Design a protein around this ligand. Sequence first.
Ligand SMILES: Nc1ncnc2c1ncn2[C@@H]1O[C@H](COP(=O)(O)OP(=O)(O)OP(=O)(O)O)[C@@H](O)[C@H]1O
Ligand SMILES: Nc1ncnc2c1ncn2[C@@H]1O[C@H](COP(=O)(O)OP(=O)(O)OP(=O)(O)O)[C@@H](O)[C@H]1O
Ligand SMILES: Nc1ncnc2c1ncn2[C@@H]1O[C@H](COP(=O)(O)OP(=O)(O)OP(=O)(O)O)[C@@H](O)[C@H]1O
Ligand SMILES: [Mg+2]
Ligand SMILES: [Mg+2]
Ligand SMILES: [Mg+2]
Ligand SMILES: [Zn+2]
Lengths: 650, 651, 636
Amino acid sequence: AGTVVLDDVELREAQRDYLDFLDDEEDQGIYQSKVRELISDNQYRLIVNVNDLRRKNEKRANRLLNNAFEELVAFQRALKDFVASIDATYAKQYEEFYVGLEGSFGSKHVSPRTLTSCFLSCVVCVEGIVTKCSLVRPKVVRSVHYCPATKKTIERRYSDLTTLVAFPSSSVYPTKDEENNPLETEYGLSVYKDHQTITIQEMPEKAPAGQLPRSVDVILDDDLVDKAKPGDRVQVVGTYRCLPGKKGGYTSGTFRTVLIACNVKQMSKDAQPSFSAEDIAKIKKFSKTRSKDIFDQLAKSLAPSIHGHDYVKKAILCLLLGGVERDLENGSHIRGDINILLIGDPSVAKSQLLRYVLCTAPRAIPTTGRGSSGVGLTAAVTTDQETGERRLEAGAMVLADRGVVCIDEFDKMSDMDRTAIHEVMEQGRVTIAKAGIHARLNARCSVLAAANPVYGRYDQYKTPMENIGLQDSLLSRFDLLFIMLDQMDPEQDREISDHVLRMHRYRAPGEQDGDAMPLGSAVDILATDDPNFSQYEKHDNLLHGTKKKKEKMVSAAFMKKYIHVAKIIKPVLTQESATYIAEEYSRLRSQDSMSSDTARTSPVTARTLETLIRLATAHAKARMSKTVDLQDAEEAVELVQYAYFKKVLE
Amino acid sequence: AGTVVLDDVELREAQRDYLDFLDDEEDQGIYQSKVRELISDNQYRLIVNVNDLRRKNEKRANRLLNNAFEELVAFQRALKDFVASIDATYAKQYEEFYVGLEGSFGSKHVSPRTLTSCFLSCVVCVEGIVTKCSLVRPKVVRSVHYCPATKKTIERRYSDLTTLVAFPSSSVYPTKDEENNPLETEYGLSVYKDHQTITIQEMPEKAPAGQLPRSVDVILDDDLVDKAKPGDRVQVVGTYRCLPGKKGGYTSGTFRTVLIACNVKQMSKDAQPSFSAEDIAKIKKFSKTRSKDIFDQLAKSLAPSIHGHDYVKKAILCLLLGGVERDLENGSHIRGDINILLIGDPSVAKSQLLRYVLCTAPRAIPTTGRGSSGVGLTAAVTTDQETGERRLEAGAMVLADRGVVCIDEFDKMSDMDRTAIHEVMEQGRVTIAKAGIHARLNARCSVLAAANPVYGRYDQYKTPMENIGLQDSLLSRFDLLFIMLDQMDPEQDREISDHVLRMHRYRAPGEQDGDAMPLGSAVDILATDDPNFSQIYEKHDNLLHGTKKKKEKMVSAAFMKKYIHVAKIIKPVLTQESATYIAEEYSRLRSQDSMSSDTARTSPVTARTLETLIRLATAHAKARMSKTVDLQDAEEAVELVQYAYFKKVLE
Amino acid sequence: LKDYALEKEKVKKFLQEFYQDDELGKKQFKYGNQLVRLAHREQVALYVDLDDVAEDDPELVDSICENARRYAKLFADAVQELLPQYKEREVVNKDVLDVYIEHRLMMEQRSRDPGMVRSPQNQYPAELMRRFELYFQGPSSNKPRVIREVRADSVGKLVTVRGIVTRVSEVKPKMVVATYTCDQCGAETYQPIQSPTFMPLIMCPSQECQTNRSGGRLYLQTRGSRFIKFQEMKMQEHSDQVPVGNIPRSITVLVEGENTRIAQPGDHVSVTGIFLPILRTGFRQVVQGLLSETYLEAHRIVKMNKSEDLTREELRQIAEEDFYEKLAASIAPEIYGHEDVKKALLLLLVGGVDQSPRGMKIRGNINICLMGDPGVAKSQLLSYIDRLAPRSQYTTGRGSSGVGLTAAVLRDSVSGELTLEGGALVLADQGVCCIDEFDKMAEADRTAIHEVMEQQTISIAKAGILTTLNARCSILAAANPAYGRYNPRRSLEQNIQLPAALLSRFDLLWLIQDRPDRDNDLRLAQHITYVHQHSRQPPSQFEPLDMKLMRRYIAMCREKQPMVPESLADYITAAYVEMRREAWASKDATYTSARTLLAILRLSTALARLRMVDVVEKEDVNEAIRLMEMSKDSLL
Ligand SMILES: Nc1ncnc2c1ncn2[C@@H]1O[C@H](COP(=O)(O)OP(=O)(O)OP(=O)(O)O)[C@@H](O)[C@H]1O
Ligand SMILES: Nc1ncnc2c1ncn2[C@@H]1O[C@H](COP(=O)(O)OP(=O)(O)OP(=O)(O)O)[C@@H](O)[C@H]1O
Ligand SMILES: Nc1ncnc2c1ncn2[C@@H]1O[C@H](COP(=O)(O)OP(=O)(O)OP(=O)(O)O)[C@@H](O)[C@H]1O
Ligand SMILES: [Mg+2]
Ligand SMILES: [Mg+2]
Ligand SMILES: [Mg+2]
Ligand SMILES: [Zn+2]
C-alpha cells in the first residue's frame, strides 16, 4: 500500500468542530485560557470537560465518546493547530499534544466489573484502586543511528501501534547499513516515551460483598505514568480497546483488553483545592475583620452536630492547622504535628469527632483498634516474587504523610502496635529493614486517637493514671490528652438532648420532603458522578441546627478553604512569646502547678514545651498572623493547663 | 523498514556543487540563461554540457559520469531548487525537473557493440540507428481513487523502480477500501507519465563488415518518448543499467541491461541552426550590400572544387532555396520544389555535384540506380507480425521530406522505380495501400538526379530526345535538365586540368603537415566526438590554394549554410510585372518558331514549364531576400530555362 | 548534525593543551600528565571533568551531556590516538592482558604490508586493545536529579543522581570482547559484546579458512578474551526527596571497571552516569513496541555526607587542651545539657583499641545504653549519631527485626542464585548500630545482639543459611527502664530490667531522669525556644564544629593506637577493685565483672586517642572512671 487521504470529510469536519470549541473568545474564554495556561506551565496535555462539549456540540460529544480513537486523533490535531496559533515555537517543541477528558460520562462511567465489551473503542471513566504498577519503561519512538563507515545518520520512526495491527516491518530495529556496515544507535538523539501499565480493581467498599474482585489493565503513557501508585484510588478516563495478539495461523477468538488512559486523577479531590479571586478576598477579609476571636469562631464551628467539647474542638482545630517543623541545618528535626488522645466514658461523641476529621481533612486515614495490625499501620517489606526483589509497602501512617491517622478504639490495640506507633508519632517516620532493603519512610502524620479507659467507664474516684491504661512514654507522645466524661448533670443533659433532638429533626432543604435515605446500590453510584473525584459565604444560613440567631457559624466549604490557606502560614516565635512559654513551662513542670486532689493526666516533659510551641503556632496560623504573639501563647497554655490535670474525687 | 536519511554528507556536497555550477551568474550566466529559457518555453528538462561541468568542477564531472543515478538525482534536486529560486510557481507546477547530459564523453562514448558491462550505472553516449520503437504507453505514477460509500478520496504514489528492486507491495493498485468498499479510479485526477522502449542498433556503415549487428534496449520516459522513429540515426545519452528479473527463487545470474535515456538527439545537420545576433547582422549586411549579383556570388561559390558548370550551379542553388508551395483554400496544392536532372558524358563531375548537395543540404538522402527498388524508395506496407496489423514504413523519399533525394545513375534505375517516383516528383506525396491500411504520406522533396545518355556518351549528332532515353512524362516533371557535355576543347582543358591539379595539391592547414594520410580505423572514431551530433563565423573565405587571386571572393561554406537557411524561409510574392513577363516568356517558349532550326528540345514545354519559371524566379528572389519576385528574378529564371531546354544538334 | 571528525579534533585539543595550577600555582597540563601515565600503564581510569571542558568550550559540554555514549566513545578514541606520542619509555607488561596486546601488535606489524587495504572486519576491535577507561565528572552546572524524575527524556544523557546504596553485587567478569581460536587456521576471532547475552560463534571467518573452504570451527576462550570488573547496584531515593505519600524509588546502576568496589550497601552516594536502555527481548509483551529497561551507566561514584571518603590552626585546636570538650559539645548542639552523655557518645565514636593476644580477641568497640525517662533527647541523640558516624545504621523497635538485623539469603538478580544480604548489624559492621527502643526489641534480636556485642559475629544455622557474619559494630542503645519512668521506690536491675549478661555487655549504662527543677527547666526551655525561633542552637563560647570537621577529627583519632603502660597497671587495678567493692557492698548497684575493667581500659584508650597521644596517661584513666561514675549519677 502507501495510500494517503485527500481531505477526508469527516476528519475535516471534526477538526473544524474541535478547533471551534477550543477557540473560545466570542464565548467565555475557558479553553483558550486553559491552552495558554498549559503553554505557560510547559505541558502538552489539555484536560477537556466533556460537559462543555455537550453544551457546545451534542454531535461531537456523542461521537467522541462513542468513537474515541479517531475522534481523539482529530481533537489532538485541532489542539496542535490551536496551540501553534497561540504560540508556534511551543507547538514546535512537542511532537504531539494530548487531550484528556473529564466531567460527566453518563453511561460510560463504569467500574472494573461493569466495564464490559460493549464499551470497546468508547471513552470510559473507570474508578478503582490501583493494585499493581509496572516499572516506568522507555519505549522508543524515533531511533537515530550513525554509520561510522559512511558517516551517514539514519532516523527510524515507530508509530504507536499499541492497539492497531503491527506488521513485523513496523518493529525492526536497524542494525546494518544497506551494504552491511554496522550502525551505532545515538541514544541521546533518539526519542523515547516512557510507558507504564497499572491494574485497577473494583474498590473493596464498592464491590459486591460476596465475590472476588474484578480488574482492568490500564496503559499509561508519557505524562501519565507515575500518577498512581499501588493502593491509590483513582479515576482513569480513557479508551477501552482490544489488544492484538501475536502473529499466528490459528486463533481462539479471545482478545485481551486494556484501557488506554487519556487522563488519570486521584480520589483526593480533597488533596487539591481551587481558589478564585473572590475566595481569596473573602479569606483575607475574614482574617482581617476579627483577628482576635477568629480562632474561637472556627473551633465552635468544627463539628456542629456535636454539642459541647469546646476545648476538644479547639485542640482539633490546632491539629488541623498544625505547628511548624523545625528542619535544622545539620539535618536535625523537630516535628510540627499535634497528636491528640481522647479518653472518656462511652457515648460522649469521640468517634463522631474522629469521623468529622476523617470527612474534613485531606489525606486522612481511618483505622480502628485491631483492624490494622503490625505492618498494616506502618510500612511493610515484601518480596516481589516476580523479580525476587524486596519491595516496600506503605501502611496507614505512611499513606497519611502530611495528613491525619484517626485511630479509633486506641485502647484495644495490641501493645506491639502501640509501640510501633512510637517512632511515627515523635520523629515522623517509619524505619523498616529486611536484608535486601532498608528504608526510612516519611510518615509526617498527626494522630487523633479515641480510647476508652480501663473498666470501660471512667472512674472519677481513681487517678487518671490508673484510669488510662497507657504507659508514660506513650502518653508523652500525645501532646494533648482529653478526658471526656459523662457527667450526668440534668442541666448539661438538657443541653445535649435538645441539641441531639434538633439534629434528629433536621431535614435537608427542599431536597427531601418526608422520604428515606437511599442505600446507593452500586448501579446508582455509576448513574451519577462520583463526589470523591468531583470538580462559600463564610457563614451558614440559620434555621434550627441552632436554636436562636445570636452567633454565626462558619461555612464548611469556606472553612476548608480558610484552613488550607492558613496551613501554609509559618508564624515565628517572638521573644515575648518565647519568654512567656518558657516561664509557663517551668511553672508547669513544678509541683505548685497542681493543687491537692488534682492529678496529672499526662507527664510534663520537654515534649510539653514543644506542645505549647506547636499549639501557639497553630493558633497564630488561624489568625494568619505570621508571628506567634502573646495571645497565641496564652491560648496554648490554657489548652495545656486544661488537658494536663484532673481533679480526683472521694 | 522505513528510515529517512537525516544526514547524507555526499548528497549535501553533491547538491551544493550542482547548485553552484548552475547559479553561473558570475561566470557569464550561461546556465542561468538556460534555466530561465526552459522556464520561458514551458519545458522541464535541462540539457547540461558535461564539458562545462568538467571545467567548473572536475570532481563532480567524474562522479556524475561514473555514478549516474546518485549524481543525477542530486543534480535534479539542485535544478528544482534553482528553478524555485528563479520562479517558485513554475517550479511547483512540475513535480520533477530532469537533467540531460551533453558534450564529450571520453570513454563513455560507445556504440551498441562496445557498450559492455564495465559501464553499468555509468552515463554513456551511444550512437546508432533505431530499429523498433514501441507504442507510447502511459505509466501510472499517482493513482487517485474515490469511494462512493464513504465519499473519501485516496491517492497512491508509485516510485520509478524501473532499475531498482520492486517489492510486490510497491505495485498494488487499490481496488477496495479497508472496509472492502469498492474504489473507483479518478482517471483525470491520476497522474500518468508516458513510457516507450526503443532498440538502438549499431549503424550499418560503422559496424565491422560481415558480422551480425549489436543492439541495446533504451527506455524513454516523459518528454523523451516520440523523439526517435525507426530508421533514425540518433545519439542517446543515458545511464546503463541492469533490469530486475521477476521474483524467482532461482536465478541464472543473467540480467537484461538497458539504457535509460536522459537525452535523445538527431543528426545535427537537420537541426535548427543557432543564430548569434552577429550572424543575423552579417546576413542582413550581405543581402543588403550586394543585391544584384548576390545570387551569382552564392552560385559560383557552391561546389568550389568543381570547375565550371555555372548554370548547373545556379540551378542547384535554386534547388537548395526552392520555390514557394501554394496551398489553395479548396485544398489544392502546387509544389514549390525544384527537380533537376543532369545527363552527361562520363566523368564530368555530376556525381560530385550530387555529393556536394548531400554534404550541404539538410535532409538529403542518397540513392543509386538499383540500390533502391520501389518500396525502398517510396513508402512500404508491412504487417507487424506480433500484433497482426499493417505498419507503414518510410522509404527514401518520405525520409527526404522537406529535403533532397540525390539519385545517382538515374538511368540505370529500373522503369518501375521511375514510374513510382512520378507521383512524388509532382505531388510531393506517396499514396500507399494494402487492404488493412491506406495512407497518403508527405514526401515534399526535390529530386537531384544524375543520368548518363544512351550509348554511355552523348552523341553530338543525335537529337537529345534520341540521346536521353526517357519519355516526355518523366522529363516534363524534371523542371531543369542539364546536358553536361565533355567537349575536348584544349583551352577548356587548360582551365579544368589546372583547377583539378590545384585541388590535388592543397593540404589542410595545421592538420596536414607534409606527408599525412587521413584514415582512422574503427577505434579512432569512438576516441573523439562524432561530428554528426556535435553542437565566430566569417562571411568570405580567405584566399588560399583553392584560387589564385582576383577581385571576387568566395562565400564561406558555414556562412552559406546559415544564409541559405535564413533565405529558405522567405516567401517572396510574385509581382504583376514579373507575372506579365513570365506569362509572355512562357507563351514565346511554347511557340517553336521563336527557336532556331537545327536546335532540338531537350525536354518538352508544358504548363509545368510555366510553374518552374515561377519557382525559379521565386528562388532567385529568396536568394536576394527580396520578399517580392521582381523582374530581375524573372529574367534569371527565364534565362536558366532557356539555357536548359534547348540543345544544338551538330552535323 | 555534527561532524565527529571535528569533534574528535576538539577533544584532542582539549586533552593536549588544557592546564591548571593544581599543585601550588603551577601550570601542569592536567590531562597530558594523565595521558603519560596511561601510556605507561600506570593508570587505568581517566576522569574527564566537564567543568574543565566548559572552561574553554561550553557547547562541547552541552553536546557531551546531550549524547553521552557518543562522546565517551569520541574521548576514548582521542585518548587511544594520543597515547602513542605520550609514551616516553617501554611498558613493563604489568599483566597477562598486556602480553596478549603486545603479541597481537607485534604480529600485526610483522605481517603488516602497510600499503595494503584490509577488510574492515580484519583488524582488532578498539576495545580489545585499550587497557584504559574514560569517565566523565559531570559539570557542576548540571543540578543533581531525583531518581523518580530521571525518565525517557533523559535517555542517552549524562545525569547525576543521589541516593542510598541498598544492594550491590560482587565484582564479576563481564565479557567485553569474546576471543575464539580455530582448529584449522591459526587466526583469532573477536566478538565485541553489547547485548546482555550473546550467542557464541561457530565457524571461523578467517581469510585462510575462507580460502580453504574448510570447517574452521572456532573455540571460545577466556585466555585471550577481554573481561571487565562488573558490579550491579541498586540505589534508592533519599527520604527527603520522596513525595508525600510514597516510598523511595530505586534505580539500577551498572558499575564497571575502576568504578567497582567503591559503593557498599548503606552508603550515601552521588552517581554521575549515562541513562541508557536495555532492550526487553524475549518477554512475550502485552504491548507492541520496543520496550526496554533502564539503568544508570556509572561514570563517577562519590560517597556523600556521612560516607565521605589540615591547616596549621587546625592542628592548633587539635593540640588544644580542650579539644575533647569542644568535640563533645559539638555533638548535637541543639540538645541542651547532657554534657557527659555527649562525652560518652564521643568516646563511642572514637572507640578503644582492639587487642589480639595469643588468639583471644577482645573488642575495642564501646557500647552505650541510654536508659532514660520519656522526652530526654535519647532518640534525638541516637539520630544525630546515626547522621554523623561514617558506617551507621539506625533501627527502631521492631520495624527492622530478624533478618533486618542479621542476614538473609536472597535471590540474586545478576546471575540468579542465592546471595547473602546483610541487615543492620552487617551494614553497620565497623561502625555504629543505633538500636532505639531497646527495651521493646524481640528476644531473638536480643540474643543476636548478645553475640554481636561480645564476639562481634552473628552465627546463623537456619535452613537456607549456615554462616558467621562479621558484625564489628558499636551498639548505641536507647531504652526506657521499666514502665516508662524511673521510680526510686524500686532498685536498679528492677527498673533497668536488663539481665546481668546484657547489662554487663554495655560499657556505659547511662541513666537519665528528668526531675523537674525550676531554673533548669527555664534553661532548657530558653534553649528550645531559641532553637524553634532560629532553627539553630543559641550562641555559646565556642561555635560547634561542622559534621564534616567532626568526622575528620574522629577519623584522625581512629588510627592512633595508644598503649597502656606498665606504670598504670596498679592505678587501673585499684580503680577496678574499688568499683567492684562498691558493687558488693552497696545494695542498689548493678552487676560488676571483669567487663567493668575492660570498659575502663577501652574508655581510657579512647580518651587517649582523642588527645592523639600514643600512650594512655593517668588523666585518661581518671576521666574514664569519672564517666563510669557519672553514668549512674541521676539516681542520687
Ligand atoms: N455532645 C454530645 N455528647 C455525647 N454524644 C453526642 C453528642 N452529640 C451527639 N452525640 C451522639 O452520641 C452518639 C454516640 O457517640 P459515639 O458513638 O461517637 O460515642 P463514643 O464516645 O465513640 O463511644 P465509645 O467510647 O463507646 O466508642 C452518636 O450518635 C452521637 O451523634
Ligand atoms: N569540371 C570539373 N571540375 C573538377 N573536377 C572534375 C571536373 N570534371 C571531372 N572532375 C573529376 O572527375 C572525377 C570523377 O567525377 P564524377 O565521378 O563526378 O563523374 P560523373 O560525371 O559522375 O561520371 P559518370 O557519369 O560516369 O558517373 C571527380 O573526382 C572529379 O573531381
Ligand atoms: N535537652 C533536651 N532534653 C530533652 N528534650 C529535648 C532537649 N532538647 C530538645 N528536646 C526535645 O525533645 C523532643 C524529642 O523527644 P525525644 O526524641 O527526646 O524522645 P526520647 O528521649 O526517645 O523519649 P522516649 O523515651 O519517650 O522515647 C524533641 O522534639 C527535642 O526537640
Ligand atoms: Mg467510639
Ligand atoms: Mg557518377
Ligand atoms: Mg524515643
Ligand atoms: Zn580458522
